[PDB]
Structures are given as structure tokens and as C-alpha cells.
Coordinates of C-alpha atoms and ligand atoms in Angstrom, one line a residue:
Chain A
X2 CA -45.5 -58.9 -55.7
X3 CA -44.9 -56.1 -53.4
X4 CA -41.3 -56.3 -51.3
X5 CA -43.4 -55.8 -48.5
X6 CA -45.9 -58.4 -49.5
X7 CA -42.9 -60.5 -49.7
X8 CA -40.8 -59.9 -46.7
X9 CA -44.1 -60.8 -44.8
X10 CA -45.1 -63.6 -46.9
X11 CA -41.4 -65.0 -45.9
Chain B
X8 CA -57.1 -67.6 -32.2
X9 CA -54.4 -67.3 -29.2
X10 CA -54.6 -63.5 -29.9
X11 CA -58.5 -63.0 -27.5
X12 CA -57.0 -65.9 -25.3
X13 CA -54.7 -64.1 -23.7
X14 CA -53.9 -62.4 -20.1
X15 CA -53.2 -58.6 -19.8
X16 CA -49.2 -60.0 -18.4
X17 CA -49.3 -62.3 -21.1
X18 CA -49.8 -59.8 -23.9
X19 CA -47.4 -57.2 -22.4
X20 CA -44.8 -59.8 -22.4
X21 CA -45.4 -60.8 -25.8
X22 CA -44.9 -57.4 -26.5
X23 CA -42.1 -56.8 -24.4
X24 CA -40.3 -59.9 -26.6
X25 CA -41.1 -58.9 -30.1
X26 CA -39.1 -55.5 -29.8
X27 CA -36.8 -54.5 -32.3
X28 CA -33.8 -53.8 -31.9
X29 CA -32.4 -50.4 -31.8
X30 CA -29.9 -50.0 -34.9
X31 CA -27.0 -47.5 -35.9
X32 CA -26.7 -45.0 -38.1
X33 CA -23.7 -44.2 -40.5
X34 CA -23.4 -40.9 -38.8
X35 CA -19.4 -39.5 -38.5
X36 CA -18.9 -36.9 -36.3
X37 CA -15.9 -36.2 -38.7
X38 CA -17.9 -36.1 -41.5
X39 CA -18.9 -32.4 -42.1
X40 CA -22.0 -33.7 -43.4
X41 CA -24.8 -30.8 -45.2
X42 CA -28.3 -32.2 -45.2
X43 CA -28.9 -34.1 -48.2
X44 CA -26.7 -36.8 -46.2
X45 CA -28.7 -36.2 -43.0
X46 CA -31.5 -37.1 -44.6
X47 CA -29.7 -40.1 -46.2
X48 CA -28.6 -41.2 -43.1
X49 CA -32.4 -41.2 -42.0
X50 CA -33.4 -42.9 -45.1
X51 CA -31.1 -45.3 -44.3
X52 CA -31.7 -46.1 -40.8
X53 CA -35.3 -45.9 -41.5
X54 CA -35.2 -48.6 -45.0
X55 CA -32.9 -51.3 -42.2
X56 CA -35.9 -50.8 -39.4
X57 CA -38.6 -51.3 -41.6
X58 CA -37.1 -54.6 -42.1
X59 CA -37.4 -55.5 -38.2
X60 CA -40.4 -53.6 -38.1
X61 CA -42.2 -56.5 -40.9
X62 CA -41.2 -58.9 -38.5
X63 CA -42.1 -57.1 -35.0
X64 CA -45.3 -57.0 -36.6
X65 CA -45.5 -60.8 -37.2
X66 CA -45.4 -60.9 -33.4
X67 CA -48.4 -59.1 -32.9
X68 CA -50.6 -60.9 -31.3
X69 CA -54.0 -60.9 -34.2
X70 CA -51.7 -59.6 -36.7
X71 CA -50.7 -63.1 -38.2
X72 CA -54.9 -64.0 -38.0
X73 CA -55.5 -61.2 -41.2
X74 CA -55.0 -62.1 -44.3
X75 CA -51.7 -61.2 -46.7
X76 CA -53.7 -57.6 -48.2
X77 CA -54.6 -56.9 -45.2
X78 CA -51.5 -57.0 -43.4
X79 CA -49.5 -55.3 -46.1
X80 CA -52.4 -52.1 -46.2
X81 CA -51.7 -51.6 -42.5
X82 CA -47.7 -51.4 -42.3
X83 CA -48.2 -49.4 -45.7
X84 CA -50.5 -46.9 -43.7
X85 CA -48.8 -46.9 -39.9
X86 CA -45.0 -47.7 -41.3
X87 CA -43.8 -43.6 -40.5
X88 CA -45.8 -43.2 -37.6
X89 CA -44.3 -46.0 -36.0
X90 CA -41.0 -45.3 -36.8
X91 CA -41.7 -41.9 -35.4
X92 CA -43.5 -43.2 -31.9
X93 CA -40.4 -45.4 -31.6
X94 CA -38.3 -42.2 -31.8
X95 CA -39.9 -40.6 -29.8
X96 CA -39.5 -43.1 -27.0
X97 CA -36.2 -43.5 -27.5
X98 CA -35.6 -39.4 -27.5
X99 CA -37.8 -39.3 -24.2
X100 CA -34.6 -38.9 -21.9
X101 CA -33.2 -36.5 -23.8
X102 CA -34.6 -32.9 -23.5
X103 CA -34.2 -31.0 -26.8
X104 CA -32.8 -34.2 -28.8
X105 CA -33.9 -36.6 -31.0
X106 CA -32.5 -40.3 -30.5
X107 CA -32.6 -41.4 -33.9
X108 CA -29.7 -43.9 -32.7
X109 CA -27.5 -44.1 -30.5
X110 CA -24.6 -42.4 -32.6
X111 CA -27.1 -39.8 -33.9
X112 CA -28.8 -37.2 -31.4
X113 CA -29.9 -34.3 -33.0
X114 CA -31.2 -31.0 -31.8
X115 CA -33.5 -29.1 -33.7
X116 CA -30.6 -26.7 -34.7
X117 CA -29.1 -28.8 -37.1
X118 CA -32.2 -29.9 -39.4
X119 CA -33.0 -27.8 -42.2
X122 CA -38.1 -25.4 -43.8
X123 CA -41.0 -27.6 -42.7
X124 CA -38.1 -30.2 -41.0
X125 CA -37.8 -28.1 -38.4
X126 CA -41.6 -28.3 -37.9
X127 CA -41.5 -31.6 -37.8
X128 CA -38.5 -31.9 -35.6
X129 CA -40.5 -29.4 -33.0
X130 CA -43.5 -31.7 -33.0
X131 CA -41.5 -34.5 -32.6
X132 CA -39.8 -32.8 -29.8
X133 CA -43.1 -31.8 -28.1
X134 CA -44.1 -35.3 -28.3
X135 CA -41.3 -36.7 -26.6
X136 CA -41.7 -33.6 -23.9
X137 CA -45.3 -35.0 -23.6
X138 CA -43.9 -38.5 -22.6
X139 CA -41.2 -37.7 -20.3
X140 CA -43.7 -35.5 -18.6
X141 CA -46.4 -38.5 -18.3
X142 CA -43.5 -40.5 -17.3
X143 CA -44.8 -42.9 -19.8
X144 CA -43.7 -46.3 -19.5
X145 CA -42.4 -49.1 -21.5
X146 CA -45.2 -51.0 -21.2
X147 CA -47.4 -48.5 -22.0
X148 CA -45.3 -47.7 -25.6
X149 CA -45.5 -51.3 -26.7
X150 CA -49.3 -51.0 -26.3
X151 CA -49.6 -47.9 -27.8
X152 CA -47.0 -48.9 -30.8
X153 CA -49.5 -52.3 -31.2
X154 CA -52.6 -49.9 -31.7
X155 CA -51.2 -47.5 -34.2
X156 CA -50.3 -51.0 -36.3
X157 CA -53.5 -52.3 -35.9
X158 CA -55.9 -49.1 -36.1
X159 CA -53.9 -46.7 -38.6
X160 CA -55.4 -48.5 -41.5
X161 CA -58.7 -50.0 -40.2
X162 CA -61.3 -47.8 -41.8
X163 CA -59.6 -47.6 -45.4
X164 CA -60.3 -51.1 -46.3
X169 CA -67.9 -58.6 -48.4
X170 CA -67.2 -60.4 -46.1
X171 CA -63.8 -58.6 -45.6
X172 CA -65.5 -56.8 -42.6
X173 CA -65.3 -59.8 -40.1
X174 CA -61.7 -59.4 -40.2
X175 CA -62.3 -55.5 -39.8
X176 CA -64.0 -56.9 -36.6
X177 CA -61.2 -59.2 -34.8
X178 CA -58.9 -56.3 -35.1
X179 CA -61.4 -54.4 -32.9
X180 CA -61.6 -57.3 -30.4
X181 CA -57.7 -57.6 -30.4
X182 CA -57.5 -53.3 -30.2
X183 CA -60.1 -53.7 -27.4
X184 CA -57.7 -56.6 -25.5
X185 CA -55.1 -53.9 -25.5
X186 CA -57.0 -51.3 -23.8
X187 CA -57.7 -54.4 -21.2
X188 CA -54.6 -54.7 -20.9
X189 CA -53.1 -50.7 -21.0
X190 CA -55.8 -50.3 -17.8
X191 CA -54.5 -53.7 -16.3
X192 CA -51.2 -52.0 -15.8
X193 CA -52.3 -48.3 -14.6
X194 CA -54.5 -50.1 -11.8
X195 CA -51.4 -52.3 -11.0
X196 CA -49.6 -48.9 -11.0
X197 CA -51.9 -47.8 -8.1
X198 CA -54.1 -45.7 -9.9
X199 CA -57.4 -44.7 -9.1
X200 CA -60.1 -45.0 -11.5
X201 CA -60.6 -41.4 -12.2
X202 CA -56.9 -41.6 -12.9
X203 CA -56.7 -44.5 -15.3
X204 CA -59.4 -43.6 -17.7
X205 CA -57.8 -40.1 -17.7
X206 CA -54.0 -41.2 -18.6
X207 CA -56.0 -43.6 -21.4
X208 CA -57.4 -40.9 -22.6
X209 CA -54.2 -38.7 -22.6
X210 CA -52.5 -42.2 -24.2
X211 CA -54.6 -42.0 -27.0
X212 CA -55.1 -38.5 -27.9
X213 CA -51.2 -38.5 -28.4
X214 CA -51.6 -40.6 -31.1
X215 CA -53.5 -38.6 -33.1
X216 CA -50.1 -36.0 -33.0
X217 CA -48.2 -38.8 -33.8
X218 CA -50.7 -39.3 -37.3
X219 CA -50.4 -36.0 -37.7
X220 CA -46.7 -36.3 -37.7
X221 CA -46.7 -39.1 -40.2
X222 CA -49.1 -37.3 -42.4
X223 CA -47.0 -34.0 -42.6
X224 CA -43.4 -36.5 -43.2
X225 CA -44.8 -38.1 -45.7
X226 CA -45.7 -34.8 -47.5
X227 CA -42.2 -34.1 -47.0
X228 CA -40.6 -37.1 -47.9
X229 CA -42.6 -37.3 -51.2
X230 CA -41.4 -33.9 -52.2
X231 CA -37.5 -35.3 -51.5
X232 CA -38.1 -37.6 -53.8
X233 CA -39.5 -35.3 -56.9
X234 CA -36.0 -33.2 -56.0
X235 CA -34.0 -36.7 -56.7
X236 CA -31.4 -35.2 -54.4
X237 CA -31.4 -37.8 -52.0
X238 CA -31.9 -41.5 -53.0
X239 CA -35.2 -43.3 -51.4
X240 CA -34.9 -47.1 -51.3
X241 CA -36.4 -48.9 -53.2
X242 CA -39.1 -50.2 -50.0
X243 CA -39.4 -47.1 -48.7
X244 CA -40.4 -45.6 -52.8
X245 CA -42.9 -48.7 -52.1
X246 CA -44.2 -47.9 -48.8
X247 CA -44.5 -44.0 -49.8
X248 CA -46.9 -44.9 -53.3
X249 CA -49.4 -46.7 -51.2
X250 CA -50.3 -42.8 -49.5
X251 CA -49.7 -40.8 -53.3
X252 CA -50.2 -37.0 -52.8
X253 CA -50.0 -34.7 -53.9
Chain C
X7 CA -58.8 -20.2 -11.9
X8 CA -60.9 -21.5 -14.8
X9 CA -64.4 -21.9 -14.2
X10 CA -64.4 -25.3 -17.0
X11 CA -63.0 -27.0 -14.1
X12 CA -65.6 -26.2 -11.4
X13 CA -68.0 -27.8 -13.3
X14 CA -69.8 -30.8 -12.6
X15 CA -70.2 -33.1 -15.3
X16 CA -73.8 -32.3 -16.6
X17 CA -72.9 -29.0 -16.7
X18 CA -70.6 -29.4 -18.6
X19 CA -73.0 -31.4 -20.9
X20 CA -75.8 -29.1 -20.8
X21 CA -73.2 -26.5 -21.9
X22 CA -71.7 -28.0 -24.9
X23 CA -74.9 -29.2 -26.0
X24 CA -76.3 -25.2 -25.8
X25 CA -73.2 -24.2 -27.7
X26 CA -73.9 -26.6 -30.7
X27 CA -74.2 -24.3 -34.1
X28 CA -77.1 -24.5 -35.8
X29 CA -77.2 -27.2 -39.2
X30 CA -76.7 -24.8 -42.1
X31 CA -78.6 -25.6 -45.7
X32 CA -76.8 -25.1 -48.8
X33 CA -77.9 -23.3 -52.0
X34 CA -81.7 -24.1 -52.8
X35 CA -81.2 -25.2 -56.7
X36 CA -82.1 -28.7 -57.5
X37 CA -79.3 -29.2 -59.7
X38 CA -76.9 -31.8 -58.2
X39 CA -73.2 -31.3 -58.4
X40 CA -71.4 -32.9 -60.6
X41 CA -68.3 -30.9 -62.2
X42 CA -65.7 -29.8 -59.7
X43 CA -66.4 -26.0 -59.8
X44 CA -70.2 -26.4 -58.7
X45 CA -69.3 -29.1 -56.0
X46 CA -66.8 -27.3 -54.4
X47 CA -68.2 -23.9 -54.8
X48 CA -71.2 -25.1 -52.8
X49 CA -68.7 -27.1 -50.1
X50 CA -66.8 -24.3 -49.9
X51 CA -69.8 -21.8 -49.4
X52 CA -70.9 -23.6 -47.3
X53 CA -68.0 -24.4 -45.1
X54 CA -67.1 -20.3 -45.1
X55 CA -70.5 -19.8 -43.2
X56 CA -70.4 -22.5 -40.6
X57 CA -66.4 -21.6 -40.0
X58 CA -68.3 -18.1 -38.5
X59 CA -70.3 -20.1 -36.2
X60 CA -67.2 -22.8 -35.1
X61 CA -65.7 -19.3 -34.2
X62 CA -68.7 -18.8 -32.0
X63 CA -69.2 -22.2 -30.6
X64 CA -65.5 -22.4 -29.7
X65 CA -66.1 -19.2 -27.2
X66 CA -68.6 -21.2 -25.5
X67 CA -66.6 -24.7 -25.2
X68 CA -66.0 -24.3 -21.3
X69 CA -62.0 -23.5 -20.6
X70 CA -61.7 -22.0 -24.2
X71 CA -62.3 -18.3 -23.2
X72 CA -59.6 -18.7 -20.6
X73 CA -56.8 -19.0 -23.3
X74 CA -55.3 -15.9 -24.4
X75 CA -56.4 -14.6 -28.0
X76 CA -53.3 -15.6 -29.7
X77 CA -53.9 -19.8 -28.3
X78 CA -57.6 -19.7 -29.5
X79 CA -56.3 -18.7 -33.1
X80 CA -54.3 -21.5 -33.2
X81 CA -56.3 -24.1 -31.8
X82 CA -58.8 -23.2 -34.6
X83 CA -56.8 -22.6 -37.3
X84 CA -55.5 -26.4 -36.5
X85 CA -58.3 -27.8 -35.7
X86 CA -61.0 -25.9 -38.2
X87 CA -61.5 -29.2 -40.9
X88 CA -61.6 -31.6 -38.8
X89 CA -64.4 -29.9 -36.7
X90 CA -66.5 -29.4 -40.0
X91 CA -65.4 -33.5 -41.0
X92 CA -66.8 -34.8 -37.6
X93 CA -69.9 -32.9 -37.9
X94 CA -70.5 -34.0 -41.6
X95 CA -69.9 -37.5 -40.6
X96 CA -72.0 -36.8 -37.4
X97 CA -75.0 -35.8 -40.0
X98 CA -74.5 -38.4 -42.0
X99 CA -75.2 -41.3 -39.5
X100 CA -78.5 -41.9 -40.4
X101 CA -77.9 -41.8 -44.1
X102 CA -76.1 -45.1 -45.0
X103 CA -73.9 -43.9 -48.3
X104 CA -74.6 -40.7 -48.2
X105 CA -72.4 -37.4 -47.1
X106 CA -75.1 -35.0 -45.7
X107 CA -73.2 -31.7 -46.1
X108 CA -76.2 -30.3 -45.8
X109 CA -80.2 -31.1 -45.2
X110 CA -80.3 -30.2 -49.2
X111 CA -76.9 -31.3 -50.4
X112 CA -76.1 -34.9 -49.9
X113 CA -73.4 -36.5 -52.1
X114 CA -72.4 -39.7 -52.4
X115 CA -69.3 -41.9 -54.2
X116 CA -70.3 -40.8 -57.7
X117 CA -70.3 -37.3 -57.1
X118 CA -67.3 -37.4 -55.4
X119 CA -65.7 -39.4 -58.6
X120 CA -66.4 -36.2 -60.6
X121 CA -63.4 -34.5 -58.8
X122 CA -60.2 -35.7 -58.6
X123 CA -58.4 -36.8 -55.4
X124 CA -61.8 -36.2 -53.7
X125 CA -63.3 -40.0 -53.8
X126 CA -61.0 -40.9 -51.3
X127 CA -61.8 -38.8 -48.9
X128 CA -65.6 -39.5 -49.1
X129 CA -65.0 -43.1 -48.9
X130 CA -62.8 -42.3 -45.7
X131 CA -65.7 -40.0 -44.4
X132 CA -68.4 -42.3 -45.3
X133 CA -66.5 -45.4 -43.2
X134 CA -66.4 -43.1 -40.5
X135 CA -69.6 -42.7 -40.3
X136 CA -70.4 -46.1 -40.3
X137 CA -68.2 -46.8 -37.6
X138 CA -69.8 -44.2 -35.7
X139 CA -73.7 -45.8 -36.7
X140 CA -72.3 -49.1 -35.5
X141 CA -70.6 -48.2 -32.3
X142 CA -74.4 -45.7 -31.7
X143 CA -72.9 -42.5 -30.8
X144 CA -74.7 -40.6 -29.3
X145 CA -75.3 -36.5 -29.5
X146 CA -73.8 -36.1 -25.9
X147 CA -70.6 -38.0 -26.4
X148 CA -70.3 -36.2 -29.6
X149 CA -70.0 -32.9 -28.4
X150 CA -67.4 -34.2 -26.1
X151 CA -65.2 -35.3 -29.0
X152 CA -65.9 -32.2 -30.7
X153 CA -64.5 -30.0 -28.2
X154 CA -61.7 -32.4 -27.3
X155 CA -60.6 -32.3 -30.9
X156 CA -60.7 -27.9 -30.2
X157 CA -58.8 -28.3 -27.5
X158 CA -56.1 -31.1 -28.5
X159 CA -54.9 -31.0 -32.2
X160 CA -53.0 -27.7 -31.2
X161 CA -51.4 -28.6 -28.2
X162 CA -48.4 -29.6 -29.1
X175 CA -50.3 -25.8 -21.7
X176 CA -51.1 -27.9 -18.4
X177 CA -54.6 -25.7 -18.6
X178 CA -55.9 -27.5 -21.7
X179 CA -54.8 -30.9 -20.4
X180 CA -56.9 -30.2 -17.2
X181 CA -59.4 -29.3 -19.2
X182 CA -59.0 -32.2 -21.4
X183 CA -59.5 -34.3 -18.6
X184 CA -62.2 -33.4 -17.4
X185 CA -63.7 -34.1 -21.1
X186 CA -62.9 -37.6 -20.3
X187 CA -64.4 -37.4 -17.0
X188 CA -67.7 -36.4 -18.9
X189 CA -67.6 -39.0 -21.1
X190 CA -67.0 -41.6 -18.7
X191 CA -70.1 -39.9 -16.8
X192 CA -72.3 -40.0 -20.0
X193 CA -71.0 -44.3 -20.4
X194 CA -71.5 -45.1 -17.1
X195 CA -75.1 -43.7 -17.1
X196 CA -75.9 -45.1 -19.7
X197 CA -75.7 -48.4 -17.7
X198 CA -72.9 -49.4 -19.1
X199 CA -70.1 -51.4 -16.9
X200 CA -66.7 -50.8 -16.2
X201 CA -65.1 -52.7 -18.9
X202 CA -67.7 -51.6 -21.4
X203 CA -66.4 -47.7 -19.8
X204 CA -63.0 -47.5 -20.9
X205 CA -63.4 -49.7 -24.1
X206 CA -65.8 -47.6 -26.2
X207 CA -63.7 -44.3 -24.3
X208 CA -60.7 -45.8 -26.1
X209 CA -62.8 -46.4 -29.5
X210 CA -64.4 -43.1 -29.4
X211 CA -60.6 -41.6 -29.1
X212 CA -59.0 -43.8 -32.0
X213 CA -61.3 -42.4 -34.2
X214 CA -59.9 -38.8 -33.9
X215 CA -56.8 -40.3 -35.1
X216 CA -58.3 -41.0 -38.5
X217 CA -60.3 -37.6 -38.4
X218 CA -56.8 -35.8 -38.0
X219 CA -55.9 -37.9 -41.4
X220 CA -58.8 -37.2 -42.9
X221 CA -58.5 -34.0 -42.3
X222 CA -54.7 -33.4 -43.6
X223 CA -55.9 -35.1 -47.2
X224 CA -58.6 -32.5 -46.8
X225 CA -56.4 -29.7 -46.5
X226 CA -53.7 -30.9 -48.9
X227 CA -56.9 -31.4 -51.8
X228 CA -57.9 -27.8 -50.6
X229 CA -53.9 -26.4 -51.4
X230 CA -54.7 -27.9 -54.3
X231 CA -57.6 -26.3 -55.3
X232 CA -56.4 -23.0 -54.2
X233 CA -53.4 -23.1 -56.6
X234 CA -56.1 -23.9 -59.2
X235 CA -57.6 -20.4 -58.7
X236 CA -60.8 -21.6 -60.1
X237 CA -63.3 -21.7 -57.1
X238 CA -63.4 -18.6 -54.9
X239 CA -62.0 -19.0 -51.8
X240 CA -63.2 -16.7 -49.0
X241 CA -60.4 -14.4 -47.3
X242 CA -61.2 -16.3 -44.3
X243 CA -61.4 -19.8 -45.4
X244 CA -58.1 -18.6 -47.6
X245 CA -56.3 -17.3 -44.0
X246 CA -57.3 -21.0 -41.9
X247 CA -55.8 -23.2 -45.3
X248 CA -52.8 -20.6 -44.9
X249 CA -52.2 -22.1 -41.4
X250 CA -51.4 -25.0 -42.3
X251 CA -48.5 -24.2 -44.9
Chain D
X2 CA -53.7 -8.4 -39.1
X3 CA -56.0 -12.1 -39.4
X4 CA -60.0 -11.9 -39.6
X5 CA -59.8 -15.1 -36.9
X6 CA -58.4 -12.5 -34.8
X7 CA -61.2 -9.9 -35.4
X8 CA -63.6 -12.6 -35.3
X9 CA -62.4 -13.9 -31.6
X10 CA -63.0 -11.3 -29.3
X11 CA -66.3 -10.0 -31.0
Ligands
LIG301 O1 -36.6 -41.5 -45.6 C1 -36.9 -41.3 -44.3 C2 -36.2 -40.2 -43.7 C3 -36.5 -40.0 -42.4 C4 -37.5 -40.7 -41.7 C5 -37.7 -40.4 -40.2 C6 -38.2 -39.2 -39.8 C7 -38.7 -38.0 -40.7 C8 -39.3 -38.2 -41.9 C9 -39.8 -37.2 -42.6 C10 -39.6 -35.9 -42.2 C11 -39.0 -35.7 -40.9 C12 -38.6 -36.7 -40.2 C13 -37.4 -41.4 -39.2 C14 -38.2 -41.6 -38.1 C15 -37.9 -42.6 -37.2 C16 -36.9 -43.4 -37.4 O2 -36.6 -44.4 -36.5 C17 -36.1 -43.3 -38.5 C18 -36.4 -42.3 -39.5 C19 -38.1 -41.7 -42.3 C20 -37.9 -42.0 -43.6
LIG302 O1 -63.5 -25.2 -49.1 C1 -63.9 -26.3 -48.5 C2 -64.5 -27.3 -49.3 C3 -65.0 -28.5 -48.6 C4 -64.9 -28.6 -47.3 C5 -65.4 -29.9 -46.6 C6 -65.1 -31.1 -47.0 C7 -63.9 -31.6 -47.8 C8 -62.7 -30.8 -47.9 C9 -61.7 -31.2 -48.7 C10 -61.7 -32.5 -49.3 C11 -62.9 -33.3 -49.2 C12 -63.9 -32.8 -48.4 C13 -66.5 -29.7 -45.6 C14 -66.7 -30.6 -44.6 C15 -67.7 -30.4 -43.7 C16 -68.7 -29.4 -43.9 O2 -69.7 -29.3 -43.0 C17 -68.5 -28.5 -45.0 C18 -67.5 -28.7 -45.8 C19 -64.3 -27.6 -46.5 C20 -63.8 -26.5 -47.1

């Protein structure tokens, strides 16, 4: 999604 | 969760550890620089801390404990006001000046308007600390609780959640009052420097609020280039 | 010397509590809102009288007078919306889903759905005020915040921080006679406090929708309510 | 020059 949904899914 | 389990030392030190770093700008005193590029060296220091900000907040104790949404919604509401509280704490020993890294002080005669507002408030802010002779285990508590209650109350059963982040908010006022008793403090005295703790943070919202007005005009002038995270965290507020 | 500081802490109770403005009504047609022009003309007629007796409530908030002319303009002229949003959400306690601007205007979701950029802000105001039903806030403790938000969203002098303090010292008094223990003290203090952090931001959304509706020159806007939105620019 | 101001010391 998001790149902050991903750098914090990571 | 290991978040409610913990000591008063114990959470400090957890906060202590999960500190980011404190990164460099692109600033060369050479360069002649205008203001577009002072901006873009802010956007730029700012996009690279957001980064170690994501995972500071990891570190958190609770933080991990909310789900994905929930997470996301409260660096997309607190992201500029903790930038901001971090430069003011690094600014604190510098009277006038603005620490946004080490290779970029700047005093509020270089800075454009409504920046030099902003850069006043920031200033008085950082007055306000040196003057409390705030401490650095103080500003990690304080940083924690703009994270965790920024967001809170723009959110089933999503409202237990809504409630451990008041149980972990109310471990960190433990704790904040843990270290002004251990600081010698009477009573009287530590509920007053809370107090004074937290009122602070309404300035630094305030702050936040009145940048991102600011920064959401920069980017209808398309002078300066947002990243594309910081375009992503800026949408989640809208305005105007 | 400032007489706010001589105080003990009742009095300064009994005075704040003497010094609350009276609850204003709105216009008495039974017509609700609906349409942006009639819901904001009625908010905004309404929040033009009750700025006239903030004005006269703010000389009575102990240390206030003290401050020279000039510092009282600027502390209200700072601090004017969010004074009217905690006292709306203060209202609205006992009306689950419902803003009581007035004892005859209460609005809900819907309503605020009929202008735009204006449901967020109720939703953010009506949270509030759930958050303020749950934690049971009571009338004394929130005159306290009131005047603390007076005296602190313009700060930024050692005066107002003395004064300030002694706020805190009052509502520590009011906590710890109402039985509760020392813990219990400075945990709902810090609760109570947080909240003034989203009051400020509900308050700047406020004012930016008001901007808003200014440049759209279709509701009147009082000289006065026009001079404390001009603060802000 | 500010009603506030006129308003204040009444
Ligand atoms: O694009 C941006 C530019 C500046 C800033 C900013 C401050 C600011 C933003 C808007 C208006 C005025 C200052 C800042 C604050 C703390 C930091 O560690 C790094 C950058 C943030 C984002
Ligand atoms: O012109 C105005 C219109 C509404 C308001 C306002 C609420 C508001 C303002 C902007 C956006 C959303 C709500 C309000 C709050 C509490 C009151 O007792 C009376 C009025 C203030 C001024």
C-alpha cells in the first residue's frame, strides 16, 4: 500500500 | 504485553536505546544558497529521518501491540511534530539557533513570511527548554507521548486498542514522575514541571499544524520538490 | 505582586467558577440547519455574542488583569476558538452524538455533512467529548483547563507560568479531594492536559475552515469575530 | 485601532 504502511510492515 | 510490564528505568532505557540518530544535511557554506534550496535541504533531511523515525517508533514500547492502520494513522498525524520536538532538543544549547544538523544552524535571519513565524516559535520552544533545563530523559518521554497521543481521538471494537494506548500513555507519566522524584523534587514540584511538560506540547501541535499549512502551500508552488513520503505523509492532514 | 498568587486554592475555585459566562441560546426557529449559509450563520451569531462575554470572563480569570493590555489581546485573540470548542464539548457531555452549541441548536454528523470540510471537525469534537464523559470531568477541573488554555496557547512571561502553576496546584487540590490517590493525581492531571493538545488542533482546522469561509464572503462575519480570525493570518 | 482593545479595559 502506503510507503509508510510498508516501511513498517518491513 | 511487555509494554504495562515494565519499570519506570526499564522504559527510560528502552527509550534511551531506540534514539535516532542525528543525520546531516547537504548544507555548503560555499554554496550561496536562496531559499528554495533551504527548504530542499529540510525536505531532504526531513524525508532521510522519517525513515529512522518508522523504525524508532517500532521501539516503542505498545507501539508494535496496535495493529498496521493504526500505527500508520499515528506517524501520519505526529510525523512534523516530532521532527520539530527533536529539533528543538537538539537546538536547546544554542540561544537564537536552530540545530537542524550538525552542519546546519540557522538563526532566524536567514529564513524567509510565515517561516519566520514558525522559526520564532520554534525558537521560543527551545528557550522554554533550556530554561526548564529539560532533560534527556524527559524528551524521550515526551517524544513517546506525542507518537502515541497525536492521533488517538481521530480514529467496534477498535476502541480497546484506543484503550492500551491510554494504559501505555499513563506508564509514561509513571515513569516522567519516577525521574523528577529521583531528581529530588518535592511533590508540589513534580506535578508542576508535568504539567509545564505537557502544556509544551500543545505549542509543539500547534507548530506542526501551522508547518504543515506551509508546507502544503510549497507544494501547490512546485518550486521545491516534496518526496514522494513526505507528499504521502502531508495527504493524510489535506487542507486547505 | 499579583494577587492570583495569594490565593489559596478554593479561592481560586470559587472564583473561576463565579466568572463562568452564562450558556447562550441560539435563534428560536425550529428549522434545523442544513445548507451551509444557515448553519454557519447561526454558529457564527452565535459565537460573536459569547466572544463578548470570553472578553468578560477573561478579566476575572485570576492573574489575567495583571497583564498589560497589549498581552491580554493576544492571549485571546490566540486562544478565542479553542475557548468556545472546550465549552461546546463541555455542553455536549451529556448528549452522546450530539454538539450542543446551544440548549436549542444541537447538530450532529449529518448536519455537519451538509458543509464541507466541517464533518471532520465535529467528529473531532464529538470524540472529545466522549473522552471527556468517560474520564467524568467535572465542572471544577473544567474551569481550570479553561483558563489554563487563556493563559498558555499565547505564551510563547515568568508571570503566567507562576500563574500557570498554581492552575496545576488547583487541580491537583480538586483530585486529591476527591479521594483520589497519588498515582490516580498525576495520571488524570497528565490526561486532562493531553487533551488541550488536540483542542489546539481542533482549533487550527477551525480557524483554517473559518479563512475559508471568510474568503467565500457569503456568511456575515462580525467586525469582531473578522479582527480575532485576522490574528491568526 | 482593534475592538478587543476597546473591549478590554471597559
Ligand atoms: O519538507 C520539510 C521541510 C522542513 C521540515 C522541518 C521544519 C519546518 C517545516 C515547515 C515549516 C517550517 C519548518 C523540519 C523539522 C525538523 C527536522 O528534523 C527536519 C525538518 C519538515 C519537512
Ligand atoms: O464563525 C464561527 C462559526 C463557528 C464557530 C464554532 C465552531 C466551529 C468553527 C469552525 C469549524 C467547525 C466548528 C463554535 C464553537 C463553539 C461555540 O460555542 C460556538 C461556535 C466559531 C465561529
Amino acid at each position: 500500500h502506503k510507503i509508510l504502511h510498508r516501511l513498517l510492515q518491513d | 504485553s511487555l509494554a504495562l510490564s515494565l519499570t519506570a528505568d526499564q522504559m527510560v532505557s528502552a527509550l534511551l536505546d531506540a534514539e535516532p540518530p542525528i543525520l546531516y544535511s547537504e548544507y555548503d557554506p560555499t554554496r550561496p544558497f536562496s531559499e528554495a534550496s533551504m527548504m530542499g535541504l529540510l525536505t531532504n533531511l526531513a524525508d532521510r529521518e522519517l525513515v529512522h523515525m518508522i523504525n524508532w517508533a517500532k521501539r516503542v514500547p505498545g507501539f508494535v501491540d496496535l495493529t498496521l492502520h493504526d500505527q500508520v494513522h499515528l506517524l501520519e498525524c505526529a510525523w512534523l511534530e516530532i521532527l520539530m520536538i527533536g529539533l528543538v532538543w537538539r537546538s536547546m544549547e544554542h540561544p537564537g539557533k536552530l540545530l537542524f544538523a550538525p552542519n546546519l544552524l540557522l538563526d532566524r535571519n536567514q529564513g524567509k513570511e510565515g517561516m519566520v513565524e514558525i522559526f520564532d516559535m520554534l525558537l521560543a520552544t527551545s528557550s522554554r527548554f533550556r530554561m526548564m533545563n529539560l532533560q534527556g530523559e524527559e524528551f524521550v518521554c515526551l517524544k513517546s507521548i506525542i507518537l502515541l497521543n497525536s492521533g488517538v481521538y481521530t480514529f467496534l471494537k477498535s476502541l480497546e486498542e484506543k484503550d492500551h494506548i491510554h494504559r501505555v500513555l499513563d506508564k509514561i507519566t509513571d515513569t516522567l514522575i519516577h525521574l523528577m522524584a529521583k531528581a529530588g523534587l518535592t511533590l508540589q514540584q513534580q506535578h508542576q514541571r508535568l504539567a509545564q511538560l505537557l502544556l509544551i506540547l500543545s505549542h509543539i501541535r500547534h507548530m506542526s499544524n501551522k508547518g504543515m499549512e506551509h508546507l502544503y502551500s510549497m507544494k501547490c508552488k512546485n518550486v521545491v520538490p516534496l518526496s514522494d513520503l513526505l507528499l504521502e505523509m502531508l495527504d493524510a492532514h489535506r487542507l486547505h
